[PDB]
Amino acid sequence: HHAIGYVWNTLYGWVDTGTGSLAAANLTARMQPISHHLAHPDTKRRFHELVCASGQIEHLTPIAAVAATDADILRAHSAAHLENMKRVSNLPTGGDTGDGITMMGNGGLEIARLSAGGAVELTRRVATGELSAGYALVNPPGHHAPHNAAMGFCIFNNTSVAAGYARAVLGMERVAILDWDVHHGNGTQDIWWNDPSVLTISLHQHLCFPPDSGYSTERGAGNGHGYNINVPLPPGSGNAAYLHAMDQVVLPALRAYRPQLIIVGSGFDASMLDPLARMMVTADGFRQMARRTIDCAADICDGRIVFVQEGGYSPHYLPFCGLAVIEELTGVRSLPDPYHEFLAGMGGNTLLDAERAAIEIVPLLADIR
Amino acid sequence: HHAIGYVWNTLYGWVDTGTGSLAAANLTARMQPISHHLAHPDTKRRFHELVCASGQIEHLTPIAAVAATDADILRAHSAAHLENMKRVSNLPTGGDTGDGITMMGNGGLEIARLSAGGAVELTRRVATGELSAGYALVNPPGHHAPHNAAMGFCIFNNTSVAAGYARAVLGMERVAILDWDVHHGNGTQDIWWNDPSVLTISLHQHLCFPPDSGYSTERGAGNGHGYNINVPLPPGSGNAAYLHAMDQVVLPALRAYRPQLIIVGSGFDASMLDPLARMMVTADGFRQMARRTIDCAADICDGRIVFVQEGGYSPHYLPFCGLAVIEELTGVRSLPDPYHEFLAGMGGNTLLDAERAAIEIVPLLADIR
Amino acid sequence: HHHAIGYVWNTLYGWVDTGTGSLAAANLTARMQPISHHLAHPDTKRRFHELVCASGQIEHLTPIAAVAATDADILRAHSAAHLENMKRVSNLPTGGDTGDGITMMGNGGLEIARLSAGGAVELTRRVATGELSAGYALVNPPGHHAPHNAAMGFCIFNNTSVAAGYARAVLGMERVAILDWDVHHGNGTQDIWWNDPSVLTISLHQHLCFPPDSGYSTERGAGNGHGYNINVPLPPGSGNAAYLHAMDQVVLPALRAYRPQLIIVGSGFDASMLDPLARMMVTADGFRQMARRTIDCAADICDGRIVFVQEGGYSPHYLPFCGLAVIEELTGVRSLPDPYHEFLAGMGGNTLLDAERAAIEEIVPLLADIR
């Protein structure tokens, strides 16, 4: 049938990103304090508020986040990492999660558990058939956190916690994670590196972040060899490149693999107005990407698809990119993208030779059994 | 000798950009109000504050802005445009300058006059030999405003007001305006379209803004034919492309033309972290661009070079891009770019075939007499 | 017995565009520099809502959707000319001045004004029918300064008067009371019901804080309404002791004398210890005690029918805790401390000063005229 779940929790908007821009404010470096860190939670809150103010919320089934348990977290992460996060969160003013930039406040583990747990709860309810699909608008994000660490503002790897739950608790034999956050999903890649039961795909700007990963030659290991697929694209790639990648690589990979559930790491940092990447995707591009992936799920896994928020750093534009994806889930297309004409004139809608060549990963599809 | 002028006026930081993102907030469109418009003056104020906090201010000669007179403005703009700006500024709550997006507050003409006048005052003092060079950190910007209108948040075309002053008041026969704001300097192009006495050069992202201009075929008209040079570059172009453009096109054009003064429209919206374009220039890239242009001025026009602020929309990073240019003027290189390693890993430092081909404008150099 | 507490929040209450000025607009000639957050910026009320959710109070509330106030609803409190002027201003391509030179609406800003008044109406309807026992409408923009024929003091429509008008005309209640404890005089509400004894209007406020020329004890209504408007102006620096003495000596006796069938509270928190727009010393515990007293009074005299409707309050730091205290008195679930309690308790306001006592006692002889 048709019932679309939606997860927002007030505390997703209360993540304290501090007073720096990216790293902390630093007087010796003359990095002046600023009100809004690049990753400030207001960007995602504005998406939530637009979901409500547009009336999309009336077509969604609100789903309460339920805190991820230690057992849930341990399906994706090491005990040492979980214990370190408990340690850092218990410090009187929080602290450094290990990388020197990713911080948690005192009690910040509460929000990290609710973020991973929002993904799990939506996954559970879609997998059982209570819901047909859904969108978990979580924060903090997940895809940079590998098995043994926090990284890139990610405390736990939300989509991997959800995949682990689908595998262990729901008994699914095959799950796919499709990450279209513009940054390489190195954490997700790491977690399932040796494991063919979770197909991991990352469409991203080549070497945007991290600086040393996301190459096409990173394909997994052992029994997992062939079950990690990176699609690095050049800076300036737009809707044409992204849709060519979907049609030539992503959708064929999903059809070859036959997952029982598709989890999308849904970032909007590939947008035309994002500060933290150089891509040219518009809300109409994300719309088409979502439509294609939802339709693929309908064909191959009884429509079982869960979108989980990753990055995106335009408070101005991200809400409209997100809303387009929500509208593809609900089928209620009731608000225009007010930037559409303005951004459409900038380009990205022609498949350039260098973009085409980057996508033409195609010979690796044959190794997905 | 060596004396570097620097213009900042408090009111440059008081430009009211409203409560929208780009266009105004709009309830029917569900464009939620936001504290900082993309063009909020804090970005440029943070540059000023870094100039001070870094100690660069101790190596600069502060120059007070002096309001541009009607006569000054009329060297670049029509009487109808000036009168319309006086009209709009006199409205009790200001209003629409004509394009439906560019607004002035009540009394906002004061700031527009100080912005153009900051460029004029620095130009005067460099041309006389009181100063060797300088940087006018003005706001609002100028380069989109054509002869008969305000456009793209530009009320008056600051660099053209300064060029007009150099021509009419100082009696210079040849002036060059080099615009490296990432958006096409359509206003400047328009003003001097028929005029070979002001060479206008625009290095920009192709079709970023405006959507219908900046093509290589836009070359001026009449006696001005050959004295407008557009260098449109593809999205994703970085330091390699920008420096190749400098070496192959911009610097040869300046040497062919033999201006008596070089005015640089110094935007930083080509930076790696800018939301309003897709280019990959780092602070080190802007440093090298500035070094090259200052050295060219030393060779061909007795060092007479005036930098005038155009766009740039990263409050995080613009200050460091600007500071690099200031350091090239003063010769005091006392602060690192704290983002250098982070951004250097993202690329843009290899000249791609498509970038090289866009630059290879070279056959037009022969028409500069 | 029955317990179900309604709660109204609409996303658009947080989207009210207060501009780039502090109070009036930014002004270059006056050298009033633009600022991100106007004093009345919606974030203050949004932070209250978010605390209601993050504290877990939301799990004890029954969410009630705001329904846009119709023209008919608005016309029970305001003139046709005022409604038409608001439709006119809201239809202007970039909105404009609502009449006073400071209160503005955006293009389409009438949508939010309707949802604000309509949130009060919807909660009133559902409490009056017995679906709900009581509730809190966390609306924005506020209401109490808007008189019959105008917008004023960032109020477009007089939300509590629209709700009272609905209770009177649609539900057929013969007597309604509006108790306003916003720190500013409820001049709009006073104006609307000035000649009308069917809506008892009470305003507890800082004397001459805003507006400058109203809220005196001598403003008592007119005609058949004479005696059915009660102002309790208090001196600057009044705190919990003064506010509770006013409740016990004046407000609660007035309500008991009048026997309203519904009590509507204009629930502002601008009397708080940390508010920039008044000089009063009320703490979250003070508002808690005020709410408790008023809810208990409603239980005694009108079958518990009480509707709280948000008015002002300008501390984004502290207002959420003041508001949460009132919500907790409605739900009976007292699960979070006021983290400012010790800090503010040391500042005073907890002793009834002679001047405060005397200001309150000025109103006591007027209670006898409430029939």
Add this chain to the structure above:
Amino acid sequence: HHHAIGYVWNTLYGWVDTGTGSLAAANLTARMQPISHHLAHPDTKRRFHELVCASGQIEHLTPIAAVAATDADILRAHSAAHLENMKRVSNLPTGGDTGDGITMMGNGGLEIARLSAGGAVELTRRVATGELSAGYALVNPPGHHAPHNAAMGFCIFNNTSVAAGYARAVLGMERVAILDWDVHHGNGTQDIWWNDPSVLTISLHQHLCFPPDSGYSTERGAGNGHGYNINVPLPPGSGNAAYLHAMDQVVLPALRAYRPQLIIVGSGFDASMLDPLARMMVTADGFRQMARRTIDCAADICDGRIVFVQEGGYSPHYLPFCGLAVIEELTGVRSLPDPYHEFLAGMGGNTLLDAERAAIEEIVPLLADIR
């Protein structure tokens, strides 16, 4: 005769990192939501500076560069342990807690604390030598809560005491006065000079506003310093009438009795009508009159030697106009109105209430002990 008015602003005064809390840090367990602007955010003082410039007052001032306070400078007001603790905290990779659990410094935040104290010192030196007639040091962080052995109340070092210590030890002045009209008790300054009659310390403040346990009239110094600390605690709601009565009856007579060779004013604007962190009713015209009186007193008794040093004040909207009024009294160029004047004048505070008069009169018998 001579007229040259020094003015200190340093960009880094605007870069003080006040964090993401309201007052204490953001706290998830307490459900204190993060906020962009802490109550003490530097933008309030930066907006004052920008108004000094945009109003054209800057053209009538002599800009004076702040020079970092040396260890020797700091040690005239504070203990070696406190200085070493501040060097320790500032050297920590991400800074930390200065001791009280709320006052923090960033890594390298000692640089700004030194520039703040050093701005006061540099202006003091240049006024005392006769290079300047008077001046205003618009410093941040503030000073007056920091006692000899600690940081407190967002004060790292006691700027005015560092300046007084310099005047005493380096310039050889035998008598200095510090007049603090920040609305909070200058407990730090009181502590530093408690036993010392060579620095007369006066604090006009809201009674028990902050700290909670100090500022009583009975706190008069000790030993040879007995009689050389004067507290003037005023009740909440006191306005221009009370403040000017306190100036005329207590402050100015105390200064005339003491005959300081230099007057340092701890110039806070947190007594303003719109301040969130106190309940007083002073307007820009009130601060203007206070400044005029004090400058004229300096002209009469110490050859015009007066240095104003910024303390608190938490209205980004209104503080700039309060500060500008003081600057205009120094320059004598009165070129911009207070655009809030009419709005605030209607709220009151301009009548001397009996309780206000009595609070002030409590201090008058202590004037006789100033020898």
